[PDB]
Amino acid sequence: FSPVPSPEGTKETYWETKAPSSDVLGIGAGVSSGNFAAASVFAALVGGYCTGQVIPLTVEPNPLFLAGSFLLPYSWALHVAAWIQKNNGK
Amino acid sequence: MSESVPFLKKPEALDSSMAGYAGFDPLGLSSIADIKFLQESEIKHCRIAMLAAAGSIAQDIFTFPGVSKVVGTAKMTGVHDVLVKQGAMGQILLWTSFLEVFGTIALLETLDGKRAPGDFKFDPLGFSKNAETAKRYQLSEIKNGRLAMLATGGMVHGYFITGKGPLELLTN
Amino acid sequence: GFDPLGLSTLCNVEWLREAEIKHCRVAMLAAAGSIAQDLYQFPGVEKIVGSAKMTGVHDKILAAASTGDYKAQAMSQILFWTSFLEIVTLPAVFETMNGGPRKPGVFFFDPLGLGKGDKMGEMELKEIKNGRLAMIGVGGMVHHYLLTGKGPIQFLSGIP
Numbered sequence A: 001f002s003p004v005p006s007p008e009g010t011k012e013t014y015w016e017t018k019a020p021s022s023d024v025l026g027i028g029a030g031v032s033s034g035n036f037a038a039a040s041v042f043a044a045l046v047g048g049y050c051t052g053q054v055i056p057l058t059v060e061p062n063p064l065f066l067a068g069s070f071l072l073p074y075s076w077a078l079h080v081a082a083w084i085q086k087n088n089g090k
Numbered sequence B: 001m002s003e004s005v006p007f008l009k010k011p012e013a014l015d016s017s018m019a020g021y022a023g024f025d026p027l028g029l030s031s032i033a034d035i036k037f038l039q040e041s042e043i044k045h046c047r048i049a050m051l052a053a054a055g056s057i058a059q060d061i062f063t064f065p066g067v068s069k070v071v072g073t074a075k076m077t078g079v080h081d082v083l084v085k086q087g088a089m090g091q092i093l094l095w096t097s098f099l100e101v102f103g104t105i106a107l108l109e110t111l112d113g114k115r116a117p118g119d120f121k122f123d124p125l126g127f128s129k130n131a132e133t134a135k136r137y138q139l140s141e142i143k144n145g146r147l148a149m150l151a152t153g154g155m156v157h158g159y160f161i162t163g164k165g166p167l168e169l170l171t172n
Numbered sequence C: 001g002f003d004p005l006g007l008s009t010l011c012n013v014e015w016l017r018e019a020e021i022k023h024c025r026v027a028m029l030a031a032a033g034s035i036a037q038d039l040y041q042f043p044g045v046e047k048i049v050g051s052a053k054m055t056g057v058h059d060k061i062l063a064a065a066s067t068g069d070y071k072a073q074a075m076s077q078i079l080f081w082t083s084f085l086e087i088v089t090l091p092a093v094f095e096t097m098n099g100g101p102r103k104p105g106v107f108f109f110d111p112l113g114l115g116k117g118d119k120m121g122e123m124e125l126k127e128i129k130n131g132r133l134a135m136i137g138v139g140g141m142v143h144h145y146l147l148t149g150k151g152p153i154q155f156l157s158g159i160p
């Protein structure tokens, strides 16, 4: 009804292809699919290991293991980015 | 292809002109972040690291008047804990925070394409008035700064094993 | 032309080729290392390891490292440096698969340039055959240790 503002750098992200354009990856638009796939596997193993090392949680835990356990959900987004880049020829 | 790493491809973001270029970016991190931000970040890490390695050596060489009576034994990172009880660190923190506030404004101006990475125009003595000798001092700053990051990490970690401190650990 | 079970149809030939060369080189080091470990012992190691043979050394140094021993962190250090090397040379094996210039196994590592000097039409096959033997020989060495406490030289010397 009036112009709706969006921040500078807003681009068109609607896709009807097999995979979205690499622009949907933001700052990761230039990373290759091999690098996302290897980072995804790495993050999944390190995140699962760190998660496993602190499943009995105690009042004093190792702080690095806590931070490293956040790599398991991050790996899901990494392998989705690997599928997007492999189907974009990157 | 890349110079430093012959099997790997030349980094896209990196350029020959960018001081301290060896074509070294195997993981392609320069593609992820803005290259000027990484350049400013490397230059800043270089200068802090240079000061810290020189300080580590100097702390083994001598001690300013009265410091022996606040801290007796602690040499590298132990001194920081005693000084935070006093105002010594808080003071450095406050003034460096103030200097970094204008560093933040400088970063914003750089990221819009106007200022150059690490260029704060701080050249009181006449050391860069040639623009060929200037290029040599820029590259020397980056190489000495990179060496200093590795050194500062090396010295602090050696203190973590032994507690000796850098030069005394060299002696024994 | 040896592939009776057709396992190159079940994976990319480039990935398999680099994996084969890596297995061959690592096993070269393992087989040569076990024979050298019996023949020569680096100084000081007899107090940390005693007289343990190839696989026993891994478990015994990591047992000592499992206490807080400063003089037993060899395994972690080798693991660290090999992991660092595999992390930074990791994009190479994906560049080869993507159609890149570099062939499987070539990191251009020729300091002495012995391969560069003469035409390298045979040194490649020399490495591949020697490494294939190195893998099988490592297999031999480890399982024979797992049955009899003898090492390379001890087991070869007699015949139980």
Ligand code: CLA
Residues within 6 Å of the ligand: B048, B051, B052, B054, B055, B056, B058, B059, B060, B062, B063, B064, B067, B071, B074, B075, B079, B080, B083, B088, B099, B120, B122
């Ligand atoms: C990252 C840098 C860093 C940090 C955090 C510290 C921190 C400290 N040092 Mg170390 N030190 C440093 C650098 C550093 N110093 C340098 C560069 C030297 C000289 C080579 C020394 C030499 C030194 C000795 C000999 C001793 C300390 C001591 C101390 C402690 C007491 C605080 C004090 O009086 O320091 C004061 C430190 C200085 C005045 C040196 C600072 C010099 C740099 C070059 C400041 C330059 C500012 C710059 C020119 C402005 C640029 C402006 C531009 C950005 C526009 C504290 C732990 C004492 C201690 O507890 O040790 C046991 C002690 O005895 N320091």
Ligand code: CLA
Residues within 6 Å of the ligand: C026, C028, C029, C030, C032, C033, C034, C036, C037, C040, C041, C042, C045, C049, C057, C058, C061, C074, C075, C078, C109
């Ligand atoms: C998969 C290979 C492998 C593994 C896991 C081990 C593991 C071990 N060895 Mg064995 N060893 C190996 C290979 C291996 N070694 C090789 C290749 C040799 C030389 C023939 C030896 C000779 C050897 C001796 C003599 C001793 C050990 C010992 C040990 C233990 C402590 C670490 C140590 O000091 O090693 C020392 C190992 C070396 C110095 C060999 C390093 C050879 C490098 C890898 C050659 C690299 C060349 C090339 C230029 C690099 C290319 C880089 C490129 C990829 C970029 C540890 C269980 C010690 C022990 O506890 O035994 C009881 C001991 O006394 N090893």
Ligand code: CLA
Residues within 6 Å of the ligand: C025, C026, C028, C029, C031, C032, C033, C035, C036, C105, C106, C107, C108, C109, C110, C114, C115, C123, C124, C125, C126, C127, C130
């Ligand atoms: C039989 C051993 C053997 C042979 C013939 C080769 C041959 C080759 N390698 Mg490989 N390599 C090997 C072992 C070997 N490698 C091992 C074990 C490693 C792991 C450290 C490597 C790591 C490696 C990398 C990372 C790269 C190569 C490359 C190459 C090629 C060019 C380099 C060259 O000509 O060097 C010839 C190498 C030798 C003749 C090996 C020297 C063996 C000496 C004579 C003795 C070994 C001593 C050892 C410590 C054990 C002693 C015995 C013990 C029982 C006492 C060529 C096809 C490069 C490539 O493919 O492209 C250019 C490359 O980038 N290799």
Ligand SMILES: CC1=C(C#C/C(C)=C/C=C/C(C)=C/C=C/C=C(C)/C=C/C=C(\C)C#CC2=C(C)C[C@@H](O)CC2(C)C)C(C)(C)C[C@H](O)C1
Residues within 6 Å of the ligand: C027, C028, C029, C031, C032, C033, C109, C110, C111, C112, C113, C114, C130, C131, C133, C134, C136, C137, C138, C140, C141, C144, C145, C150, C151, C152, C153, C155, C156
């Ligand atoms: C690459 C390169 C470089 C390099 C390098 C390096 C590190 C080169 C290293 C090459 C190596 C380490 C070769 C080792 C091969 C071992 C073999 C073939 C063993 C087979 C064992 C068998 C068959 C057995 C057995 C049996 C015995 C005796 C024991 C029994 O209990 C068991 C059993 C009965 C089974 C350099 C620096 C030169 C530069 C150059 O520019 C590039």
Ligand SMILES: CC1=C(C#C/C(C)=C/C=C/C(C)=C/C=C/C=C(C)/C=C/C=C(C)/C=C/C2=C(C)CCCC2(C)C)C(C)(C)C[C@H](O)C1
Residues within 6 Å of the ligand: B076, B077, B078, B080, B081, B149, B150, B152, B153, B154, B156, C084
């Ligand atoms: C915690 C704490 C404090 C503190 C503190 C401080 C000052 C902490 C500083 C920590 C630093 C600077 C650590 C840096 C470590 C460097 C590393 C790991 C580089 C390794 C190089 C590698 C892996 C490869 C290198 C490579 C090689 C060999 C081959 C190729 C070249 C290269 C790529 C270079 C206090 C003061 C608050 C006190 C408090 O009570 C305790």
